[PDB]
Design a protein around this ligand. Structure first.
Ligand SMILES: Cc1cc2nc3c(=O)[nH]c(=O)nc-3n(C[C@H](O)[C@H](O)[C@H](O)COP(=O)(O)OP(=O)(O)OC[C@H]3O[C@@H](n4cnc5c(N)ncnc54)[C@H](O)[C@@H]3O)c2cc1C
Ligand SMILES: Cc1cc2nc3c(=O)[nH]c(=O)nc-3n(C[C@H](O)[C@H](O)[C@H](O)COP(=O)(O)OP(=O)(O)OC[C@H]3O[C@@H](n4cnc5c(N)ncnc54)[C@H](O)[C@@H]3O)c2cc1C
Ligand SMILES: Cc1ncc(C[n+]2csc(CCOP(=O)(O)OP(=O)(O)O)c2C)c(N)n1
Ligand SMILES: Cc1ncc(C[n+]2csc(CCOP(=O)(O)OP(=O)(O)O)c2C)c(N)n1
Ligand SMILES: COC1=C(OC)C(=O)C(CC=C(C)C)=C(C)C1=O
Ligand SMILES: COC1=C(OC)C(=O)C(CC=C(C)C)=C(C)C1=O
Ligand SMILES: COC1=C(OC)C(=O)C(CC=C(C)C)=C(C)C1=O
Ligand SMILES: COC1=C(OC)C(=O)C(CC=C(C)C)=C(C)C1=O
Ligand SMILES: [Mg+2]
Ligand SMILES: [Mg+2]
Ligand SMILES: [Mg+2]
Lengths: 594, 594, 198
């Protein structure tokens, strides 16, 4: 029971009681007492990153992989905390938690100019639900107790706890048997709110549900699908809701937006007369101008956060609720409406949505050499199973991937959708693998994203954390090249050079095979479209054999303009469209997934 | 003269008038108008980094290389700004400027949740002299005008300017011929202050001058040396003042502190009866406990910043002044004192200091296999000329380097002494090379520091920026291993693994030769001490031939405890000491440098 | 000559050298050492206000009356500083200085919920050129030295100096004869600009 221990020893018991089994980090002198307590305690597995930013994005990937996870990022004082700000921003932006823990100078030296001492509390305040320097050893367990409440309650977000060295080593009395986690706060919609929403949905003649990341955050994907099935209402996931209904479900109507969207999704949204928003937030890249998005449509919005409702557009209804609590009541009310005979038949509207989904396509089956990126995504759909879990960040690589890959379960699209920090992909993929060693993790990066935190591949090598990384290499910051076309320039976006050690990369610059191999991983380079599928098969074998990351680099044509625009009705199609399966053979209408 | 132009076009004229010729950065959609103006203007050379943190440390290295330089770091909105915080902290901590410029969401969308939009103003406020989102196009030139005043005035520090997209493209009227930089504010010591300081120095019987980074910041190294020569007072540079008097000067008495210090330096400081501090700040790693540092000594402190004086200890005098203004007056007063016959002879004290410097040494000439790191620094002193410019960050690599390398001019030790962010070394070295293509740049890293931002080697390859990188590889976070000895543990600090592609690294993990070569550079691995010198000679040839970075990796013994302690009188010597040149042959007393 | 004295005694010499002769205030337990030093030094005339906001606006009027004047407003910890915010805003907004000085809890107790202790540094930062809690006794003269530079230089504005009780009473070595005010920073137009304007 009660015993004297260091405050960091009490912290290890609190982390255990809060479900922590894993931590990613980089030790240093100011956080050694915490590492010492973690060693003494056992049962937190620590993964040593090769950049503090890598540890912080591994924590994000760990959080995102499985409902209830909270990835932990550990670091020393000074520059370690400033290397975590980008991940705190990314987690805050997507409403997900990570717990960052930093060492700090001793309490009495906080305003001297101690070596590597920085006011991380002030720096991290704008990108966290709480950032606190702990000022008493006895408060260490209580600050952690509050941190877990905040990371799980309301709109989730990250916390940073900063630990002065003397506060860590100071002796307190603590009884782990008496520690209890705080209750989680989640508001819930009343029956009066939900009956009104269902009445409005029954009155609409061409409704769609927009299912956002809040549905996945609430672990409510099955309920979201059940509610759509009972009401026969087509579903448009946001990028952050993608996966909460399977892509081959008859009611999955595609995605909507300016970039990561389908031609059928935008066409269905523009044809609809109501948007029933559940756990979304009507993001600018999803809506375009709100005036066009809302034109002729009633808008319902269910959100756990009151100040998200009406922030970018005014809903017709507006309900504060956790998405699971709300969907539980929505299913119950829809079932009462079904027994009463009050749910309208929607065969015509569902048929119109399905015809758009069958005809408004984009070509992927390109035989071109050098390779066209859209062909890579076709081969990925064929090579990987229905249970594949994609991890990606930003770029033409990621945008075309969201346009052309397919996903069939929640938390199988892992993507920092609001912040998009380059270098996220490798560490995030490692964090997903650490959360679930049985997950079939496949990452997608362009060359520039792959280079930012390329050294993290050695983390997968040292710890034998296997996954497949698809690397689509155009020797370009391709998205920035495309956005520069409006300035009639192509400027500071090229990465090519004649590699003095590798004439075989043909002026593409970095030799990613040699780099990945030096970092202890396996790698395959593909120049021809027909060699992609065999490369994915060899990569699976190399993964099983060596249990390390395997990089499949596809050499792309330098310049491909991916479809995008400034409004839902203005997306330009630069590359070939398709209206037939032969040009787009991995649409779920045409292909059975696993 | 007067003409209508975009506010970013006016910004290009302001940067030109402020002396900017170089920028390091990563473009993105929100900062494209600025890149468009930079292309149209010409005459800023842009270097494309492969991590935004790399661009920001290149800017730091560019600033530090040459008095009057201001390195510029450019990036897009969102995660680009959060990737700059570590460099803003490092520059602030060392009192040097960089100018960070970020794109931002349009003014009217700042409080929506725009894609990749973050409150960088609030995040960067604690680590900058000014961080401002510019709210009017006409203010863009005025905010830059104020930024340059702040970066050069008082205690120098960095500025971040955040540019909403609509503010960048908006039309203003601007006349470059009428633009003038603001005057720089620097307080100057009065003759009454300086005569009092010289009186106190004349009264001391065993004085030392502690010459800090403020002397180099003020570009006053020649005056600092002249004042010491006229008064015959031995000089102890801080780590940040190192180089402001040559290491082979008869009055250079070594360095003082807990880690980057000499046995003779600490012994001389403890034997002295006055510390005449010029442009230093009495840092904790320099003093140990202030009670022991100041015991029996009068303390003078000249600093440009009033609130640095008395922050960590109370000086006997205390003078607010720019170091150049102060040293100009100190030389004049010392010359008047010399003509009056009032400067005491100091032959005995100078002789006592020189005898300590001849006898209180540490061994470097080790024949051990695997290699002992102290032998690497001996070979570097022999291989490189007197004009070598070292760039380094933190680790046992850097601490023993400061103990054992020698430097002979100001701004030939380039080191982020207060913040020490890992990954600093490669980008900082590239920034020094960009500032001065004729500089003989040699970097020193341990393996972990080298890995953080290893991809920046491809920046040197793509742009042909040559320098030599000495990489001392112990497959350890060696400094953290050593600091863990107090916790009787060795935990989460090892980087070794059996590399499945390279049995020749013998379980050391990452193959840095293969990685550096894939990134387009040249690399040599050394296992035996006698092969170091020939490797440095081949590296010079490869550099001249290919004009890319050349990495010389020395495989170290896994475990070496570098000398350090908690007080000046308590530094533990784990490895062999020396009292003879044969064991320490590159001390300047024994070796003529170039 | 140099002498041992409390930091608040050294503060009185700095104020005298910077031309202060008048102060408006309301004493309290946390600022008593400053009042004790003011009494011992003499030659600052103190006007006792009947509201801390009254003292703060007296300081504004004193500044505005005569070029070079800097009104000084004194108060205790806690609510006294929050009562000065409206004047700090009013002074900032018109580009004129006042010097506010508040007492504060001892450094060791700044994050305990000590009686009448508030984070005035954070509250006043938006409406001052500087608002600082002084962390070392030796810094009191240097913080005041910088404050007078800021109040006179560039666009003028007010400063709040927040003084922990232990910092006020701690002894320091200070030589009033060696203190000198900092130079004032004022940019000047060149002839090229004035000729263009004419
Ligand atoms: C290059 C690029 C292109 C993109 N293109 C598009 C595009 O075309 N279309 C598109 O839609 N997106 C696109 N995205 C992603 C986009 O930026 C947003 O991240 C995304 O649209 C947000 O989805 P969401 O509305 O579900 O919001 P989320 O960020 O997932 O958050 C929605 C809401 O969930 C709420 N919430 C949290 N927990 C709960 C809970 N338990 N119960 C209920 N509510 C809860 C939060 O309060 C929040 O308001 C793109 C991203 C990138 C990087
Ligand atoms: C692992 C490690 C070990 C280290 N070990 C030691 C050690 O043993 N000993 C040691 O000394 N350092 C050591 N350092 C470096 C140490 O942390 C400090 O960076 C260093 O001591 C500061 O030197 P300085 O006092 O010259 O301060 P600086 O940071 O260089 O600043 C000194 C002052 O210069 C002033 N100033 C700025 N511009 C001007 C101007 N124009 N005129 C006048 N003043 C001006 C500033 O206001 C500031 O107060 C170590 C660093 C690391 C990473
Ligand atoms: C830290 C950071 N800096 C800048 C950006 C802006 N950005 C978005 S995509 C992109 C280029 C992506 O290049 P690559 O990963 O090669 O992908 P491609 O578009 O070529 O497929 C950049 C610089 C960002 N997201 N994060
Ligand atoms: C971002 C960051 N995280 C952590 C640290 C703490 N730190 C200082 S030295 C060190 C290990 C250095 O290892 P390496 O570069 O291999 O050098 P070695 O000490 O082994 O010579 C670490 C982690 C830091 N300085 N910066
Ligand atoms: C040609 O290569 C060049 C770049 O790389 C894409 C740059 O970023 C910037 C310049 C000026 C340049 O010349
Ligand atoms: C009914 O659901 C659907 C199919 O299954 C029958 C398809 O094959 C193809 C489409 C587009 C579809 O919507
Ligand atoms: C043996 O390798 C290991 C590490 O690498 C040094 C760790 O950081 C942490 C653990 C738990 C471990 O087992
Ligand atoms: C006089 O200066 C000195 C020399 O030159 C004569 C030395 O050789 C060696 C030392 C230690 C020295 O201080
Ligand atoms: Mg990197
Ligand atoms: Mg690319
Ligand atoms: Mg090492």
């Amino acid at each position: 029971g009660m015993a004297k221990m260091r405050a960091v020893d009490a912290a290890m018991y609190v982390l255990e009681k809060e479900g922590i089994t894993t931590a990613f980090g980089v030790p240093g002198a100011a956080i050694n007492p915490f590492y010492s307590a973690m060693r003494k305690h056992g049962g937190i597995r620590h993964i040593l990153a090769r950049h503090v930013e890598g540890a912080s994005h591994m924590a994000e990937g760990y959080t995102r992989a499985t409902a209830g996870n909270i990835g932990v990022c550990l670091g020393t004082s000074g520059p370690a905390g400033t290397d975590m700000i980008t991940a705190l921003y990314s987690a805050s932006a997507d409403s997900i938690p990570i717990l960052c823990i930093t060492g700090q100078a001793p309490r009495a030296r906080l305003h001297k100019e101690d070596f590597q001492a920085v006011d991380i509390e002030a720096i991290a305040k704008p990108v966290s639900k709480m950032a606190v320097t702990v000022r008493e050893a006895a408060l260490v367990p209580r600050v952690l107790q509050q941190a877990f409440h905040l990371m799980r309650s309301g709109r989730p977000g990250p916390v940073l706890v900063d630990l002065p060295f003397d506060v860590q080593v100071a002796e307190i009395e603590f009884d782990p048997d008496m520690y209890e986690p705080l209750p989680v706060y989640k508001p819930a919609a009343s029956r009066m709110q939900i009956e009104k929403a269902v009445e409005m949905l029954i009155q609409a003649e061409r409704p769609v549900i927009v299912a956002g990341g809040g549905v996945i955050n609430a672990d409510a994907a099955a309920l979201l699908q059940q509610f759509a099935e009972l009401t026969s209402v087509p579903v448009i996931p946001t990028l952050m809701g993608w996966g909460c209904i399977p892509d081959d479900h008859e009611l999955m109507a595609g995605m909507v937006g300016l970039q990561t969207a389908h031609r059928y999704g935008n066409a269905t949204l523009l044809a609809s007369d109501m948007v029933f928003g559940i756990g979304n937030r009507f993001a600018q890249r999803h809506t375009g101008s709100v005036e066009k998005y809302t034109e002729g449509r009633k808008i319902v919005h269910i959100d756990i956060e009151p100040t998200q409702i009406g922030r970018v557009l005014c809903p017709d209804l507006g309900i504060v609720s956790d998405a699971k609590a709300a969907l539980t009541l929505l299913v119950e009310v829809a079932q009462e409406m079904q027994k009463a005979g009050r749910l309208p038949c929607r065969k015509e509207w569902v048929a119109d949505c399905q015809q758009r989904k069958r005809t408004l396509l984009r070509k992927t089956h390109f035989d071109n050499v050098p390779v066209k990126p859209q062909r890579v995504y076709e081969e990925m759909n064929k090579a990987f199973g229905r249970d594949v879990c994609y991890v990606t960040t930003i770029g033409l690589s990621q945008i075309a991937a969201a346009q052309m890959l397919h996903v069939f379960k929640d938390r199988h699209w892992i993507n920092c959708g609001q912040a998009g920090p380059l270098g996220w992909t490798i560490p995030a993929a490692l964090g997903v693998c650490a959360a679930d060693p049985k997950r079939n993790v496949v990452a997608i990066s362009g060359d520039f994203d792959f280079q930012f935190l390329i050294e993290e591949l050695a983390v997968g090598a040292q710890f034998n954390i296997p996954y497949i990384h698809v690397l689509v290499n155009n020797a370009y910051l391709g998205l920035i090249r495309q956005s520069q076309m409006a300035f009639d320039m192509d400027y500071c976006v090229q990465l090519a050079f004649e590699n003095i050690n590798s004439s075989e990369v043909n002026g593409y610059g970095v030799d990613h095979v040699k780099v990945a191999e030096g970092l202890g991983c396996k790698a395959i380079r593909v120049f021809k479209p027909e060699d992609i599928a065999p490369a994915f098969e060899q990569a699976k074998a190399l993964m099983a054999q060596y249990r390390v990351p395997v990089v499949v680099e596809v050499i792309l044509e330098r310049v491909t303009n991916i479809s995008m625009g400034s409004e839902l009705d203005n997306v330009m199609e630069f590359e070939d469209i398709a209206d037939n399966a032969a040009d787009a053979p991995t649409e779920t209408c045409f292909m059975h997934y696993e």
